[PDB]
């Protein structure tokens, strides 16, 4: 069944148990404990100076705990990357997710992290998007990307690297 993949990441749902996560990701791809505590971290192929990866957080250390957090880098590709430095500069704190997407491009972004601190409640949801310019998603070494972050669906801040 191979390494961790975007397909597997998408198959995994908020609310799943530790065993359901391992069964989908492939236990040999995953680790827990150590630097990750009681989260489960799952590796794909080499990229950057590390690996494409997913990280799954759980409501507690309990065995019956549920997935309340999904993070990934380099597992999911943006469908149509059109972010530019100019579009980045038009994004403003206080924008909705919808407003941000219209500004940076509807297919420019993937979900870097999504966390529900009150799971199963969606109150206080925090979200990081990773957004890319036309050749920004690669190898794991991006040619112009941005991080856009939200709380309760409202943009809290933004940062970019190498945009033009």
């Amino acid at each position: 069944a191979g390494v961790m993949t975007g397909a597997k990441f998408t198959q995994i749902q908020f609310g799943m148990t530790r065993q359901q996560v391992l069964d989908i990701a492939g236990a040999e791809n995953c680790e827990t404990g150590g630097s990750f505590g009681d989260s489960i971290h799952c590796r794909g192929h080499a990229a950057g100076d590390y690996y494409a990866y997913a990280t799954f957080g759980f409501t507690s250390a309990a065995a019956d705990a549920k997935v309340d957090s999904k993070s990934q880098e380099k597992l999911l590709a943006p469908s149509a990357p059109t972010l530019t430095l100019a579009k980045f500069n038009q994004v403003t704190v206080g924008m909705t997710r919808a407003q941000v997407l219209a500004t940076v491009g509807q297919g420019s972004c993937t979900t870097w992290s999504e966390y529900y601190p009150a799971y199963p409640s969606t109150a206080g949801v925090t979200l990081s998007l990773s957004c890319f310019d036309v050749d920004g998603y690669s190898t794991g070494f991006y040619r112009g990307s941005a991080h856009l972050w939200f709380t309760d669906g409202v943009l809290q801040g933004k940062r970019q690297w190498d945009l033009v």
Binding site: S35, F36, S39, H41, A46, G48, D49, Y50, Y51, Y53, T55, G57, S69, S71, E73, W112, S113, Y115, P117, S128, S130, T139, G140, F141, Y142, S145, H147, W149, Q156, G157, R159, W161
Partner: protein, 261 residues
């Protein structure tokens, strides 16, 4: 020598190697005085600098660091996950060394007075070559002939030996540094790929992502022999030349063969 030249020709760039057998004193050297970009390999020395500072600042490693999302940068597997609770200086150091965590490395650089602070620590152990000039991710540009964020294979190896096997760190700190390098997760296709599976290795990798530029340095403990310390760095003339882990591992095999191991 001839083998290194052939390997680097196939690669389409330049390879830098320096290896020392701490038992015999033998060495192997190819472009060992030339500058190569450090990339993320600077993070091992950063952890060592943090350890040295803890010798003069009680409780440093246990100090909790709080940060928000503005501190995040791509390739930050550990720090991204602990955002809501913060991480200790020790946890940041483990993440920077073993997972090449970017935001963790920046947080630690800030603790040490930035790139200049790290460079000053390296000067303090007698390394006159090492320079860190920028932060993650800008330090990865790897422009040919740019001296920013570079060292030489010999300087890397000499400093690595001082920190892991010599007296540059006090004993407890030195063991902690060794333990972190031994637990690195990013080096399986590099120096570790060049040696028998029963030899213990601690290493730190670097990968710039442009200009064929990547590297690895390591302390290797062959069965029944004194440790070997070595560094393998690569670079290439075109921005779109890709690095090759196999080339790093091959050069590592040549080095060990060169010391007769």
């Amino acid at each position: 020598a001839e083998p290194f030249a052939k390997l680097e020709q196939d690669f389409g760039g330049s390879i830098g190697v320096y290896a020392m057998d701490t038992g015999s004193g033998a060495t192997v050297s190819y472009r060992a005085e030339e500058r190569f970009p450090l990339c993320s390999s600077f993070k091992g020395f950063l952890a060592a600098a943090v350890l040295a500072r803890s010798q003069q600042q009680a409780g440093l490693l246990d100090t909790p660091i709080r940060y928000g999302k503005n501190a995040l940068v791509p390739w930050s597997p550990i720090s991204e996950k602990y955002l809501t609770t913060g991480m200790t200086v020790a946890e940041l150091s483990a993440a920077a060394v073993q997972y090449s965590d970017n935001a963790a490395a920046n947080l630690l650089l800030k603790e040490l007075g930035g790139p200049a602070g790290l460079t000053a620590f390296m000067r303090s152990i007698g390394d006159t070559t090492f320079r860190l000039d920028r932060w993650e991710l800008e330090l990865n540009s790897a422009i040919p002939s740019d001296a920013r964020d570079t060292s030489s294979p010999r300087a890397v190896t000499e400093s690595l030996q001082k920190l892991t096997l010599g007296s540059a760190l006090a004993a407890p700190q030195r063991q902690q540094f060794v333990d972190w390098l031994k637990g690195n997760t990013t080096g399986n296709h590099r120096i570790r790929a060049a040696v028998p599976a029963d030899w213990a290795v601690g290493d730190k990798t670097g990968t710039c992502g442009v200009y064929g530029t990547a590297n690895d340095y390591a302390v290797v403990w062959p069965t029944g022999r004194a440790p070997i310390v070595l560094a393998v760095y690569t670079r290439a003339p075109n921005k779109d030349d890709k690095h090759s882990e196999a080339v790093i591992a091959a050069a590592a095999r040549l080095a060990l063969e060169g010391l007769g191991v």
